[PDB]
Amino acid sequence: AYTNSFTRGVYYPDKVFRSSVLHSTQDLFLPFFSNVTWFNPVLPFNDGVYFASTEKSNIIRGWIFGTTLDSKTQSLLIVNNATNVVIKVTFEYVSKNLREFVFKNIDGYFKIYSKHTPINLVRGLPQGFSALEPLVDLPIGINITRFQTLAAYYVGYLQPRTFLLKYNENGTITDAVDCALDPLSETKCTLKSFTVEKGIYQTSNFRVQPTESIVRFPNKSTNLVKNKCVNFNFNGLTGTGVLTESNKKFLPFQQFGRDIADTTDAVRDPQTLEILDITPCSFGGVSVITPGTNTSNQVAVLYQGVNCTEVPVALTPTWRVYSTGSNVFQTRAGCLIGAEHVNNSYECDIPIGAGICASYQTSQSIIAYTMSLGVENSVAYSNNSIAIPTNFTISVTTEILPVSMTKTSVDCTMYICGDSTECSNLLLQYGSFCTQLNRALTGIAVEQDKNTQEVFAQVKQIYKTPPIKDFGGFNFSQILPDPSKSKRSFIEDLLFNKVTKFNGLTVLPPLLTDEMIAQYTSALLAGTITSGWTFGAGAALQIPFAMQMAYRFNGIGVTQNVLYENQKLIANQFNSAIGKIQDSLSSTASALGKLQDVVNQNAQALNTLVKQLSSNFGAISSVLNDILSRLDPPEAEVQIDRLITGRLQSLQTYVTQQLIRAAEIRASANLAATKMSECVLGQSKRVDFCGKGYHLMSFPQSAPHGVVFLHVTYVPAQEKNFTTAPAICHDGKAHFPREGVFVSNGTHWFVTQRNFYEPQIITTDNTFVSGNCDVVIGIVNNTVYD
Amino acid sequence: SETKCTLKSFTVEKGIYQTSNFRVQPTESIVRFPNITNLCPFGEVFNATRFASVYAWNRKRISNCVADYSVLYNSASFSTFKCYGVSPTKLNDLCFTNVYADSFVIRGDEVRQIAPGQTGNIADYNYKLPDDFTGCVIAWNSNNLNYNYLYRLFRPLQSYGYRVVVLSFELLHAPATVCGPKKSTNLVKNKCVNFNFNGLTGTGVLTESNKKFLPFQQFGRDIADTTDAVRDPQTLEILDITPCSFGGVSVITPGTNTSNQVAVLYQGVNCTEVNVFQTRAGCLIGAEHVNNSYECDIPIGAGICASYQTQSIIAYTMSLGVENSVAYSNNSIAIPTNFTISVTTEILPVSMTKTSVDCTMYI
Amino acid sequence: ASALGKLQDVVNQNAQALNTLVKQLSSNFGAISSVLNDILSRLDPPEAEVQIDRLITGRLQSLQTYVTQQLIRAAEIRASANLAATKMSECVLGQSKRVDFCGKGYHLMSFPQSAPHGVVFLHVTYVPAQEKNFTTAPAICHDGKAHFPREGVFVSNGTHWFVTQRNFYEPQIITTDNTFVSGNCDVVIGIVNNTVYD
Amino acid sequence: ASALGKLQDVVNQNAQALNTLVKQLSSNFGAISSVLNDILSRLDPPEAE
Ligand SMILES: *[C@@H]1O[C@H](CO)[C@@H](O[C@@H]2O[C@H](CO)[C@@H](O)[C@H](O)[C@H]2NC(C)=O)[C@H](O)[C@H]1NC(C)=O
Ligand SMILES: *[C@@H]1O[C@H](CO)[C@@H](O)[C@H](O)[C@H]1NC(C)=O
Ligand SMILES: *[C@@H]1O[C@H](CO)[C@@H](O)[C@H](O)[C@H]1NC(C)=O
Ligand SMILES: *[C@@H]1O[C@H](CO)[C@@H](O)[C@H](O)[C@H]1NC(C)=O
Ligand SMILES: *[C@@H]1O[C@H](CO)[C@@H](O)[C@H](O)[C@H]1NC(C)=O
Ligand SMILES: *[C@@H]1O[C@H](CO)[C@@H](O)[C@H](O)[C@H]1NC(C)=O
Ligand SMILES: *[C@@H]1O[C@H](CO)[C@@H](O)[C@H](O)[C@H]1NC(C)=O
Ligand SMILES: *[C@@H]1O[C@H](CO)[C@@H](O)[C@H](O)[C@H]1NC(C)=O
Ligand SMILES: *[C@@H]1O[C@H](CO)[C@@H](O)[C@H](O)[C@H]1NC(C)=O
Ligand SMILES: *[C@@H]1O[C@H](CO)[C@@H](O)[C@H](O)[C@H]1NC(C)=O
Ligand SMILES: *[C@@H]1O[C@H](CO)[C@@H](O)[C@H](O)[C@H]1NC(C)=O
Ligand SMILES: *[C@@H]1O[C@H](CO)[C@@H](O)[C@H](O)[C@H]1NC(C)=O
Ligand SMILES: *[C@@H]1O[C@H](CO)[C@@H](O)[C@H](O)[C@H]1NC(C)=O
Ligand SMILES: *[C@@H]1O[C@H](CO)[C@@H](O)[C@H](O)[C@H]1NC(C)=O
Ligand SMILES: *[C@@H]1O[C@H](CO)[C@@H](O)[C@H](O)[C@H]1NC(C)=O
Ligand SMILES: *[C@@H]1O[C@H](CO)[C@@H](O)[C@H](O)[C@H]1NC(C)=O
Ligand SMILES: *[C@@H]1O[C@H](CO)[C@@H](O)[C@H](O)[C@H]1NC(C)=O
Fold first, then answer.
1. Would you say the CB of residue C141 lies under 6 angstroms from ligand 17?
2. Counting C-beta atoms within 10 Å of the first and last residue's C-beta, which end of chain B has fewer, N or C?
3. Strand order in the sheet with A237-245
4. Ligand nearest to the CA of residue C132, numbered in listed order
C-alpha cells in the first residue's frame, strides 16, 4: 500500500560540474521520508513523478503519458525493451536490480533521469544514498496530466524543494539535506554545513498571515471582522492587522489615527461610529537550539516574542512535532517547544533570554531552566574573628589576545569591472571612491604590521638562556624553544596546530614571520627567566631564579623565608600547573576561540564580497562579457551602470566593516602590548589584570595573529579562624602591629603576616606604641616582651 | 616618474609606494565551434504559403543547425525589426539554445502591441510576451496578399476584413545548439589567450585537466561560482581555465633627495611571468640580494627589507636585534653602582579640527 | 620634524578627506554634466530631474562616506585623548609604578607641554648604568639561625659579606638591624656560613 | 535631574536612531508615492517595477 521513501529520488539538477562543494539548489525534488505508493492503473502526474522498480525479471517494459490518452490529445509512449529504447509522440526517438526514474515538465522539454544500482533481498526501499543521472531529454512541449505503466513498482510525486547537495571529490553527490524536513535540517541549510555545533541559531522568520480580505466603503461592501489578523481596506487604507474595539475618542471630523512614528494604529469604520484599534499581526524570529550533531539530533525551537497560542497557526509531519506536545513553555524571550522546564538552577549552557538557559542533559533531552548566578555563601563575619591562610597554591592561567588580522588588498577596478575598457571608462565618472577604498585598505594593512611590531618587538636584545637549566627546580622546558625539534616551544606548536587570489583580491604576507615572532618570544622568556624585571628597565641584570621568586613574594606581601622553606613544593606546583596547561591544550580546542573568531569573521566577509559578484542588480546578467557580447554600446551602458553601482556599494560596505574590525583589533593589540609591558616585564599590583590571584609573573607565547599569556599567580588555600584585636594594652599604652595582624588561638596572642599564618611572639620589635588604651575600640590586655 | 605622478609631488621620501597593477595580456583569440554546417530552415518560416490567425500561432523549433541572421537583418522588406535584450549585429556571433518561430498575422495598429509589458485586448487574450522576453519580433507589409485572418476579442472570435515572426532564445546556462556563421580556430594551451566556446567568451590559460567529467556534463565551476573547467565542443577533452597573471606593482625608492635608482616589486607574481630576486612577497627587480642581516630600512614582506647602501639598492633579511647571553648562575648577581637620568618625549593627539558641512548647500 | 609625525599625520588625513570631498563635486556620476546650472539650462524641467537625481545620489554617497570616515577617525582620536588624560593623571599628578607606562626605566616624574592638537610628555626616569658582578646567597647561617635580608640582598667582594639595596651598590655590615631570623640552616637551599654583628 | 546623563544619552540616541529608521519608511525617494500598494495598484506591472 504505502512505504517510506527514505532518501530516494534525487538527481543532478544541471550539467555543471562541481567538486568538493556544498551546493544549495531549489528544484522539484521528492521530499525526504515521504509516502510513496506501492503497487496498471492510471495515475496523476502533478508537477512530476518519481519511479522505482525492483523487477528481478524486468517484467515492467514501458510508460504512457498524456491527458486523455486516446485521441484529441498528444501522448508520449516509451516501449524501452531489452533491444532498443523506442520513444514516440510528431516525435520519434530510438536509442535483483533497482531501477529509478524521474519525469517532469518544466514548460518545454521532457526530462528523464535514471539510475541502476544493486540491492540486497529486501521488500521496501533500501537505505543509503544514490544519484540519478539524466539519460535523454525530449523537447516536446506537451501537456501531460495522467500516465500509466506497461511486478512491484513504487510511484512518488515531486515537489518544489530546496536541497543542499554534497559533491564528493569527483563530481558525485554523496549526501543531501532537505531544508524543509525539520528544524535541524533547516539549520544545516542555513549554516551551509552538514554538521552543527552546539548553540542557538536564528534560522527563520515566523509571521501570521491574514485570513481574509475586508473592504469597507461609505453608504463593494464586506462585513467587519475583528480579533483576528485580517487584510482590510478602509476608504483606501491598505494594510494588514488585527482589529479590536478602541477606547479612544476620535473627534467627529477625524478619520484616521496615527502614533508618534506616523503609523496608522487606529481607524474609523465608514458605516458606523466605531473606532477600531489596528494591531500588527504577530511576527518574530525562529531560532533552533541544538547540542552538537555529534551528541544528538534533538532540537528545540524558540519563537521569539510571541505567545504560545499563535504558534500553531501560520508542513511536513516531522516539523509538526515542534508545534505542540503539551513540551510548550512560555518565557519573556518567547515560546519554547521541545524543551522541559525543571525549575532547577544550573549554569548557563545555551542562553535564551531573561535569565533562561537550555541544556542537553539526562534518556537525555533538552531542559530549560533559570540560570544560576553562583553557589551561595555567608561569610562568618564578627568583630573579633579573622580568617588567615596557612597554605597556598601556585596557579597558572592562560590569557589569549588577538593582535592582528590578515592583510587583504582588494583591486578596486579589477573587482568592479575587470578587464573591461568600457566599464572602466564608465567607472571613471564616479570620482575617487575607488582610490579612497584602496587607501583605506592599505592603511589597515600597515596598521596590522604596526600592531604586531608594537606588541612583540619590545626587547632591545635577543637574549639566550644558558645551556645549564639550574632554575631552582622550576621546569621551563615546555615553554622554552627546542633546538632539536620553527624553533617553537611545545605549547607554541600546540597553539599553531590547534588554530587553523582572483577577482582583484590579494593577501599581503606579514612583515614579521612566525619564526621572528617566536624569536621575540624566546628573547622575552630568556630575559625574564635570567634577569627578572631588570631587563625591561635597563641592562639585563642576572639573578638566581630562587632569589627572583623571593623578590616576587616580597612584592605580593609574603616574606622570603616562605619561599626559601617551601621551594620544592612551589616548584612542583608550578610544574604540575604547566603540565595541566599542556594537557588542556592538547585535549580541548575551545580556548583558542578568540583568534578563530577573527579568522572566521574575515573569511566570511571576504566570501560575501566574492559572492556579491554573482548578483544581477537588476541588469540583464551579472557577466560583463555576456552583456557586452549581447548588447550594443548605446544600450549596454545601463546594465553595466547597474553592475557598477551594486559592486561599488558592496565594496564600500566591506571596507567600512573592515575599518571597524581594524579598530577593534587595534584596541586588542594595545591591551596586549600593555600586558606585555606590565605582566611580563614587571610584577603588576593591579587586581585581576595579570590573572586571578596575586600576580607573581607571566610568560608570553606566540599564536597565529595573537599572543598567549601564562599568568603565574599566588592563591591562598587553607584558611583558619583566629581571634584578633586592633591593639593590645601592656603598660597603659596601646601597641599596634608593625606589619601584620594580632591573632590568638585560645590562650596566647601572637603577631602574624596577613597572607600566611606565621605567628611570632609579640615584641617591641614587632609592635609600635602610639597613644593611650582608653581610646581604641576593641583593645585587649596582654604583655609585650622586651 | 610613475611614483611621482601617483603622489602628485616632484620629490618622494624614502619608502615603498604602490603605483599600479600588472596584468598579463592575452596573446591570440580562439573561437571553438562545433563542426556543423546544415543551414537552419528560415526559408520555410519566412516564405510559407500562408500564416495562421493570431489565436492559432504556429511554433517551429530550430536546433542543431547554423543560423544566418545577416540575411534576415540585411533585407529592407521587413518593415519592423526591433530586438529586445540582444543586438542584431551580435546575433551572428551569439550561439543560442532553442530558437522558436511564432507566425501570425495582425493589423498595423496591433504591431506595437507585440512588445513586453504592453497591455490591450490583443496582448491579454491572444499572444502575450514575457516581462523578461529574450529574442525579438519581425514584421513586414503583407497587404498585397481574404477573411481567414481572425482576431479574438473576448475571453468569441470577431473576425474582420501584417505577417509577424517572433524569435525567442535563452542564453543562461544550457548547452548551445544554434550557432552562427563563426568559424572554428585551432586550440593552444599553456598561454594566456582569449577563448570563445559556443558563445561564452573569456581570457585565461587552458591546460589539460584530470577532472572526472560525467558524459552529460559540459563545464565545471568552483566554490565561488567561477568557470574552472570546460569541455571541448569538437573533442571529448576537458580543459582547465586559469586566469592570467596579475598583481600590484610597488616602487622601493631611497628618496629623490638621496638618489634616483628604484626597485620594482611585483606582488605575488612569480619571476617567470614578469639582478632579479624572488621573495615570498613577489618578484623584486633592481635590488641585489645580500646575505648579511641589517636593521629594517624599507619593509617588503616576509622578513625582507630594502636599503640604499654600498651605493645601490640591497635586499636582505632583517636582523631582529643584537645577540646577548646573560651570565646566569645560582650564586652570581649583577648590581649597578651608578645611574643615568633620562628624559623621554611622548606625543599624543588629543583632538581634530571641528568641521561642519551643510548637506543642502553642498549637494 | 619626523618626531611630531602623529599630529602632522592627523592634520594631513583631515585635510586630505576635506580636499577629496570638495573634488567629488566635479563628477558626473552618470549625468551628462556635473553642474546643475548647465543641466537646467540645457534640458527642460521634466527631463532635467533625471540628471539631478544622479547628481544628488552621487553627492549623498560621497557625503556619507566622508561622515563615516570622520566618525571612525574621531573614535580613534577619542581613544588617544583618553590615553593622554590617563597619562596626565597618573604620571604628572603622581608617580606611577606601571612598567613602561611613562618612559623606559623607573619613573621619577613627567612634565606636560602643549602641541597643536596634542600634548607632549617629558618623562624623567631613572636608569641603572654600570653593573658589577658579586657573589650572593639567599641567606646566611649564623650559630644555628638562618638570617634573611630585611631590605636588599647579600653580596660578597670575594672574602667578606655585606648587605646592599637592589638598585644601587651600597654595601653595609650585616647586623641584626639589617637581617631577621627565621628557622634553622637545614631547610634553606644555598645558605652560606658567615657572622652577624650584634 | 542631571547626574545620570550618560545612560540617558545612550537611551536617547538609540531611541532616536530607531525612530528615524521607522520614519524613513514614509520617505518618497523619488518615486510617485511611498505606499507600495498604491504603486502596485496605480501603474501597469512593468512600469511599476
Ligand atoms: C657615574 O656617572 C656619572 C655620569 O655619567 C659620572 O660623572 C662623570 O665623571 C666623569 C669622570 O670623572 C666626568 O668627566 C664627567 O664630567 C662626569 N659627568 C657628570 C655629569 O658629572 C661619574 O664619574 C660616575 N661614577 C661615579 C662614582 O659617580
Ligand atoms: C572518485 O571518488 C570516489 C568516491 O566516490 C573515490 O573512491 C575515488 O578514489 C575517486 N577517484 C577516482 C579516480 O575514482
Ligand atoms: C502572553 O500572553 C499574555 C496575556 O495572555 C501576555 O501578558 C504576555 O506578554 C504574552 N507573552 C509575551 C512573550 O508577550
Ligand atoms: C519544580 O517542578 C516540580 C515538578 O516535578 C515541582 O514538583 C516543584 O514543586 C517545582 N519547584 C518549584 C520551586 O516550584
Ligand atoms: C599545603 O599543601 C600541600 C599540597 O598542596 C601539602 O604540602 C600540604 O597539604 C600543605 N602543607 C602544609 C605544611 O600544611
Ligand atoms: C621537564 O618536563 C619535561 C616534560 O614534562 C620532562 O621531559 C623533563 O625531564 C623535565 N625536566 C627535568 C629537569 O626533569
Ligand atoms: C570559622 O567559623 C565559622 C563559623 O563558626 C565556620 O563556618 C568556618 O568554617 C570556620 N572556619 C574554618 C576554617 O573552620
Ligand atoms: C595556642 O598556641 C600556643 C603556642 O605556644 C600553645 O602553647 C597553646 O597550647 C595553644 N592553645 C590552644 C588552645 O590551641
Ligand atoms: C563585638 O560586638 C558585640 C555585640 O554587641 C559586643 O558585645 C562586643 O563587645 C564587640 N567586640 C568588640 C571587640 O568590639
Ligand atoms: C585591662 O587591664 C586594666 C588594668 O588591669 C583594667 O583596668 C581594664 O579593665 C582591663 N581591660 C579589660 C577589658 O578587662
Ligand atoms: C567533428 O570533429 C570531430 C573531431 O575531429 C570528429 O570526430 C567528427 O566526426 C567531426 N564531425 C563530422 C560531422 O565529421
Ligand atoms: C616560480 O616558477 C618556478 C619555475 O617554474 C618554480 O620552480 C617555482 O616553484 C615557482 N614559485 C616560486 C615561489 O618560485
Ligand atoms: C649567500 O648564501 C647562499 C646560500 O648558502 C649562497 O649560495 C650564496 O653564494 C651566498 N652569497 C654570498 C654573497 O655570501
Ligand atoms: C660578570 O661575569 C660575566 C661572566 O663571567 C662576564 O661576562 C661579565 O662581563 C662580568 N661583568 C658584568 C658587569 O656582568
Ligand atoms: C672587601 O671589602 C672589605 C671591606 O670594604 C675590605 O676590607 C676587603 O679588603 C675587600 N676585599 C676585596 C678582595 O676586595
Ligand atoms: C650551584 O650549582 C652548581 C652546579 O653547577 C653546584 O655545584 C653548586 O653547589 C650550586 N650552588 C650552591 C650554593 O649549592
Ligand atoms: C657551616 O657551619 C656549620 C657549623 O659551623 C657546619 O656544620 C657546616 O658544615 C658549614 N657549612 C659549610 C658549607 O661550610
1. yes
2. N
3. A213-216, A229-234, A237-245, A275-279, A264-268, A256-258
4. 14
